[PDB]
Amino acid sequence: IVGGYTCGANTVPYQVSLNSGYHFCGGSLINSQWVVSAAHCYKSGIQVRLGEDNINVVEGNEQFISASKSIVHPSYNSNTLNNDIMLIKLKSAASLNSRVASISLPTSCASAGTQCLISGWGNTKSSGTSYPDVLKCLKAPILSDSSCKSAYPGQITSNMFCAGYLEGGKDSCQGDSGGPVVCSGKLQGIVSWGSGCAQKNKPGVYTKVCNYVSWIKQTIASN
Ligand SMILES: N=C(N)c1ccc(NC(=O)Nc2ccc(Oc3ccccc3)cc2)cc1
Numbered sequence: 001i002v003g004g005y006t007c008g009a010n011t012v013p014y015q016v017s018l019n020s021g022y023h024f025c026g027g028s029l030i031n032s033q034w035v036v037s038a039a040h041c042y043k044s045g046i047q048v049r050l051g052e053d054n055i056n057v058v059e060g061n062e063q064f065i066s067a068s069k070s071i072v073h074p075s076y077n078s079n080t081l082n083n084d085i086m087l088i089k090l091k092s093a094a095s096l097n098s099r100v101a102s103i104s105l106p107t108s109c110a111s112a113g114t115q116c117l118i119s120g121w122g123n124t125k126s127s128g129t130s131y132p133d134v135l136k137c138l139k140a141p142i143l144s145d146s147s148c149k150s151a152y153p154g155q156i157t158s159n160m161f162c163a164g165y166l167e168g169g170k171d172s173c174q175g176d177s178g179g180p181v182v183c184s185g186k187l188q189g190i191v192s193w194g195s196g197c198a199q200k201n202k203p204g205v206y207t208k209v210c211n212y213v214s215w216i217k218q219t220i221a222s223n
């Protein structure tokens, strides 16, 4: 996260770190056995790390559960990043509580103007690289479909929305991928792509989670 702030330990209880020997993507816990992330974060050998604040230090609230299976959305296209969503099942259910909690899926799509919370352990610099050990947070508005398409012409499909600040300075970044964009307590986006991080007129682009609720529910119902 570029231009964000330190969340505070376990203040984002649904935030997940996907680790394969190292943190490589964020994710959101949506019930005791399932995590949602970006399909572009797909990897064999995922261990889900819940209850994390400093991902490099064992602090006392973590749960480390290997993934038993991953399901990349059937229509995910890696070239356009259209339908950039994936579900991960945990081999054992997580113990839910105040510090490790699931986030609700949306009943309706969010609208332009809604302020949302985006969090992750990604890069905090637009020029340079510095990866924090603790979770960073950014409050950011959903942008209109027209400003999203003006910023990235010919690239925004109906399964994507932009969120952020067209002046730059505040954005998600590499390493934040697969992580949450929560608006009014509902998971509305997944950190997916953007040109650079925090550049002027190049906001973050996010998977539009409301389009996937029936698929998430149906998939969890049979797996
Ligand atoms: N400005 C941001 N908010 C922002 C910018 C970039 C990313 N990260 C990103 O775009 N990652 C990425 C996406 C697709 C990729 O493409 C792949 C294609 C095939 C296989 C694997 C990855 C690779 C990296 C996240 C947030």
Ligand SMILES: [Ca+2]
Binding pocket: 052, 053, 054, 055, 056, 057, 058, 059, 062
């Ligand atoms: Ca830790």
